[PDB]
């Protein structure tokens, strides 16, 4: 486990890479459920780096529908919501530490529209020192992220039966190596994984989850297979067994057809990220950043894309990682069965 | 998540539902492993009601002999077992609000016979908030009780093969709405759903657990069936692989033929409670009463019945909730394919 | 003792009369000495009024050659000084409940040239409830302060050798009456009080502080005499046995010749305040608002003016309330022999 | 639950077991992961008899590669490595209290070495009720010993398809009976099982995880069978379907041939552990010493044997109980379908 | 106030001051009554230099004839007493950092001759930060004791009426300069004093507390003069009003005529240290080192000597600054009126 001094000098070494020194003001942002060891942390190590430092605490916004204890599984209003003062009290610093988990959500936007970068800092010490953020992190996403920009379609095929098709040119692609050091950039450590989105009304195919992929927030490696089928940016059709019968039941509760677009897609980056790692976890532990990131996966998600100016604000939200995937940008192979082949540049 | 703000609001309104005044003097319940949080929001949602209130702490009682953190796993003596002081502080109070889960006991039927009531809250704030009760769950809760009452049969089928019959009339129905607004009342914040027990030495039949269907407190959907043969109101077979040899291996820790009893059978009118719920959580997080009271369900239960004057006192107990049943009160259906159907005014 | 149900419901009362409502937005300003029970009061009472609230945590400050724990004791730099953001964090909000005790700073003075009312709440809770704030506080302060915004002088005689003139007219009067209703207004729950400042190099005679008055921050009742004289704003002397010599002591340590300058003079109207009360508490309980505000005494204060334009910013800061005295506006009679005589509509 | 009374007076009757009395010291070892009602009811009891004692506090070691929280998944490094001065502040005392789980290591070996006694206690409350040590554990696991230490090989069959050979001689046996009453003696309460170490590259045969059987530390049932191939002291197969794959990629992910080495080799004599205890707990609750301990289990492990002098350092390390089995020393049955036969002594 | 990111960094500089390294192990020594923030900037300070960081935490050794909460008022016993375990834990470190107080002891004596050195620091941090240690400050200090080590006597008179000679040979000079560089060192962050002890029975001659002195543990400023015969190193008589009434009673209750033996005589050389800063505090806030250590004070104290092998043992101990004295070394002035004047390497 991570002392309290170590997990300090990991914030240290993680402020410095985000570009914090005695010219920067850092915002560290809590609510009652953020980790006190790493709201210290933070405070601490902006402090050690002379920036000027305070903490903004926001009561916590309770989505009575909602269930679980994972903040990524209801995208609806936050903290943030209606609180223009507490948005400035944020939009003043040159950095936020988000240790609270505001959603992607429309307040989000306008604070990294002001130059405010924002760094999410939620899984626990443990995790934040197995994933600490690299420079070639930066380096192997953004040679990634060259291809990607490029592209104007994505395909994904698996020998369990994925078979999809996303058109692409209409919405930018996004990265996340793990610090926020460019003005105006969100990132989260830990990360190191790239997507975009498909073009409106026009992913197309079969989405297979094997045996051992993947749904977030469930936390449950599946020991049945899934078959999304997709037309025009929507899951039509959800086949299998009871994994199958849970997820319709779960999508179905929130009772909006918006659930079921498809909406960000793209690949992992990081090879100190572990597909085992939830199974030696409990749920409650975080949010599973290991299942996101790790290398060579394809992470595709489902319902709302507010944030890069979609129509859907749908609350509903999934993260599904497929392993042993091909993945092809306009028919150049990126990923072969779940290994990265290109670009070289972007290999561990 | 539920702010400290929001915790004291929801205590407010539930305290008001439970008829919690100036008049009315409220003791909130608690041990070393109780919710701080719970618990001071019920003890400030109280004094603003500006009631008379103050907080009891027990010493916890250990079982030593119980596996795992769910406290309805065991069902023996309870912190107030032998502990005649405590019961009367507690009989002391109008509303005893209980963040330590008091199992139903003669020391707990004693303290409602005083005209105390009691209000279980035990649940995690944002479950409390998700099924925060309404007037309008104990309207349609009473209407299901009325036909429970006068019904002679309970009757379960299900397609995966649920055959199970339970002539009634010796025991009385149990509702649990949320609130505990009447003298003598216990209920549990959390819930939604009602019961009653089966005739002694009579439930007959098959009870099937399906694939996604749920055993409290081991808190796992079903990923293999489990076929319980039920004879004169005991399972006399457990059938299927993995999951009903973990079954017969843990009923048989207690060593003790009681464990095998059919207690409680009812269904759920809850439907802001869902039975995906509990897959979203860690054991820990709660008992689990989403798989308790969800909409639709039957709810059977295991061994013992001492709480309705029954012979069985064994601490071995099981809740399993089955999904997609059809639920007949003497050949008039209440569920059908694990859906509401009657009375109209219960749905 | 004040109940954490109570401390809340107090909370609720004064931020009704400081026109918090669902169209106001409030900062709590915190620091790791604040205490947690009434920041808590205030968070949970704004959020019940259906106030926008969030919290801003500041780093201590310190001053190290500042001597005891009273915060009034070193009026230096502040938590602030430099740190733009975090006071762009407080100009956000209609309302600041200060708990941390935030200087009157030129930084302070910015947030409220900005519309932003703060209101200081710092005392125990116990203190707090004993002068809850009330609107016929408010009404007698104010009916006071007319009287001392038409005065050209304030005079003080004592039979124990007081006798001091201040020409008024150069700097405006400040009330005290416990709630912060008006925008761009600073108030101190508890108080009940008010006071002006000298013309520049203009207080003039002697002030005695006799057996039984007090000096803050020291927080002792004399038991010898103390004689300042004063010449052109300024003490030029002081002189008795070992109180004299303590607070020439003190006084001298701060090595600055504006430590001797003469601030804020004024009278006390809070009858719910008791010159009894210090000598019930211990000096960490707090600043001591009960010597400050008691109905009738004289309170005059030592060193920095730079709060209302004057030339001394020096650290060193002394609040003196004196009993007994007899206090003149021109000719007119507010207090005699320490009882309140006018107006008639400031009296208990 | 257990209350914090009942967990001194359980600490009172293990620490008197263990011959701690008014001639004895007794250091109670702590990190900041340490479980305060533990540490307090050590403290307390250890008093209570009259003994000499203290805490000693190690900042935690992080493993920065290691996944999840059980610090069994993890041989390397500790908090004494390098650290003589904390290693003698140990050896001072006659009885370790260990609530921070020191891995077996050179610097644990030299405090038993000087004769130091070392207890662990690490597992919540509730499950040191359930297996509170007796000196009747302690006879039953010394019985199986007086076997165990004679044997010249270990073979285990299960219907399920174990066929597995263990040559002996080469290594001792070790005992865990839960107290440590005497010098130089390592346990751990709770406990009640014994093990050895095959002879080196000489373990031959298959063992089968069944449906039901569990990996320590993923905390999983198995819902289908993993075959394990051995040759020569070596895992050099892993076969199934989901269970194995998830095996192998845990296995490799470490990239070193070192932990698919064979390493102790027992069975569980405690009747009061049960294989069904783990499915009624959270992975963070404990390291499930219910499912290494059940009466009648075949226990082996993998990675690491230093501790006895073998040559795998190998940090990444598995403990695999198995249900069913027969176990023979030399031709001489010890357990019969799960079932304790031999010694009649070391039977419930 | 000091923020917890700055004490951390305060024990740092001071830890480097005390020659702190990657080469060093550090003991944080603590009871309950710790200051838990002072005890964690400590550890983190430790880890951060990288040296091998460990806490002792000893259970809490009480007087039961004590009174108040200062720990200077009773020299006895302590945690240590009959704990060799506990001390050899101590002794395992390069340097202790002391947030518990083990008063001089035979235990602390054992810790400090195997080589190890330590630190006291049990003042609030903002008094920590207000004499936060500095090279200059041991300069100073070591200058002064070039000068005591050759004295022959030590001469005190005051306006007041102090005229007290104390010869001077048979035991060392103590320095205090806030910080704990050299090995079998003892000092105590904060400080910046010196003094000695007279030869026995020796001390000769009248001590006025005038209108003004302090004594320690009373932390009162005397508002009457208390005046002390000392006749063969033993106060014979305390005259003056409320505040000699008060000390004889203090100094009877220990019912021992030890208590009466002038121990050790010294001057202040801290100038960041202030006669004034006890009357802002209260008594529970620390020892009051500011009393101790102010610039141009002469400090006495009574009761035990054993710490220096004189024959005392006494519990009851009072330290007595003094204001405006002249102190002489054997003719040379070290303080005229309360203003330090020799060496002037000390000034
Ligand atoms: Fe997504
Ligand atoms: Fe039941
Ligand atoms: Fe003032
Ligand atoms: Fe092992
Ligand atoms: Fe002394």
Same mark, same amino acid.
Request: net charge negative; with cysteine.
């Given at each position: 486990?991570?002392?309290?001094?170590?997990?300090?000098?990991?914030?240290?070494?993680?402020?410095?890479?985000?570009?914090?020194?005695?010219?920067?003001?850092?915002?560290?942002?809590?609510?009652?459920?953020?980790?006190?060891?790493?709201?210290?942390?933070?405070?601490?190590?902006?402090?050690?780096?002379?920036?000027?430092?305070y903490?903004?605490?926001?009561?916590?916004?309770?989505?009575?529908?909602?269930?679980?204890?994972?903040?990524?599984?209801?995208?609806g209003?936050?903290?943030?919501?209606?609180?223009?003062?507490?948005?400035?009290?944020?939009?003043?610093?040159?950095?936020?530490?988000?240790?609270?988990? %505001?959603?992607?959500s429309?307040?989000?936007?306008?604070?990294?529209?002001?130059?405010?970068?924002?760094?999410?800092?939620?899984?626990?010490?443990?995790?934040?020192?197995?994933?600490?953020?690299?420079?070639?992190?930066?380096?192997?996403?953004?040679?990634?992220?060259?291809?990607?920009?490029?592209?104007?379609?994505?395909?994904?095929?698996?020998?369990?039966?994925?078979?999809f098709?996303?058109?692409?040119?209409?919405?930018?692609?996004?990265?996340?190596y793990?610090?926020?050091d460019?003005?105006?950039?969100?990132?989260?450590?830990?990360?190191?994984?790239?997507?975009?989105?498909?073009?409106?009304?026009?992913?197309?195919?079969?989405?297979? %989850?094997?045996?051992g992929?993947?749904?977030?927030?469930?936390?449950?490696?599946?020991?049945?297979?899934?078959?999304?089928?997709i037309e025009?940016?929507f899951?039509?059709?959800?086949?299998?067994?009871?994994?199958?019968?849970?997820?319709?039941?779960?999508?179905?509760?929130?009772?909006?057809?918006?659930?079921?677009?498809?909406?960000?897609?793209?690949?992992?980056?990081?090879?100190?990220?572990?597909?085992?790692?939830?199974?030696?976890?409990?749920?409650?532990?975080?949010?599973?950043?290991?299942?996101?990131?790790?290398?060579?996966?394809?992470?595709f998600?489902?319902?709302?894309?507010?944030?890069?100016?979609?129509?859907?604000?749908?609350?509903?939200?999934?993260?599904?990682?497929?392993?042993?995937?091909?993945?092809?940008?306009?028919?150049?192979?990126?990923?072969?069965?779940?290994?990265?082949?290109?670009?070289?540049?972007?290999?561990?």
């Amino acid at each position: 486990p991570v002392s309290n001094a170590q997990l300090t000098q990991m914030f240290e070494h993680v402020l410095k890479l985000s570009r914090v020194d005695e010219t920067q003001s850092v915002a560290v942002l809590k609510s009652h459920y953020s980790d006190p060891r790493t709201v210290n942390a933070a405070m601490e190590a902006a402090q050690r780096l002379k920036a000027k430092v305070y903490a903004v605490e926001l009561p916590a916004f309770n989505h009575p529908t909602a269930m679980g204890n994972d903040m990524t599984a209801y995208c609806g209003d936050t903290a943030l919501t209606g609180n223009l003062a507490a948005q400035r009290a944020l939009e003043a610093a040159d950095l936020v530490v988000d240790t609270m988990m %505001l959603l992607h959500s429309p307040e989000q936007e306008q604070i990294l529209k002001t130059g405010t970068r924002i760094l999410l800092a939620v899984e626990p010490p443990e995790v934040l020192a197995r994933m600490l953020p690299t420079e070639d992190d930066k380096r192997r996403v953004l040679a990634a992220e060259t291809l990607l920009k490029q592209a104007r379609s994505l395909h994904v095929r698996s020998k369990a039966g994925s078979d999809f098709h996303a058109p692409l040119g209409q919405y930018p692609a996004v990265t996340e190596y793990g610090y926020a050091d460019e003005p105006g950039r969100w990132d989260h450590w830990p990360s190191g994984f790239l997507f975009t989105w498909p073009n409106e009304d026009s992913a197309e195919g079969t989405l297979v %989850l094997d045996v051992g992929d993947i749904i977030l927030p469930f936390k449950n490696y599946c020991r049945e297979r899934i078959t999304l089928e997709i037309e025009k940016g929507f899951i039509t059709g959800i086949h299998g067994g009871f994994e199958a019968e849970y997820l319709r039941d779960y999508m179905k509760y929130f009772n909006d057809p918006e659930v079921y677009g498809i909406s960000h897609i793209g690949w992992g980056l990081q090879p100190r990220a572990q597909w085992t790692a939830m199974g030696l976890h409990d749920r409650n532990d975080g949010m599973c950043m290991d299942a996101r990131a790790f290398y060579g996966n394809f992470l595709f998600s489902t319902g709302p894309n507010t944030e890069v100016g979609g129509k859907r604000k749908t609350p509903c939200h999934l993260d599904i990682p497929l392993r042993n995937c091909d993945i092809y940008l306009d028919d150049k192979a990126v990923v072969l069965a779940g290994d990265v082949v290109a670009p070289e540049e972007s290999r561990a």
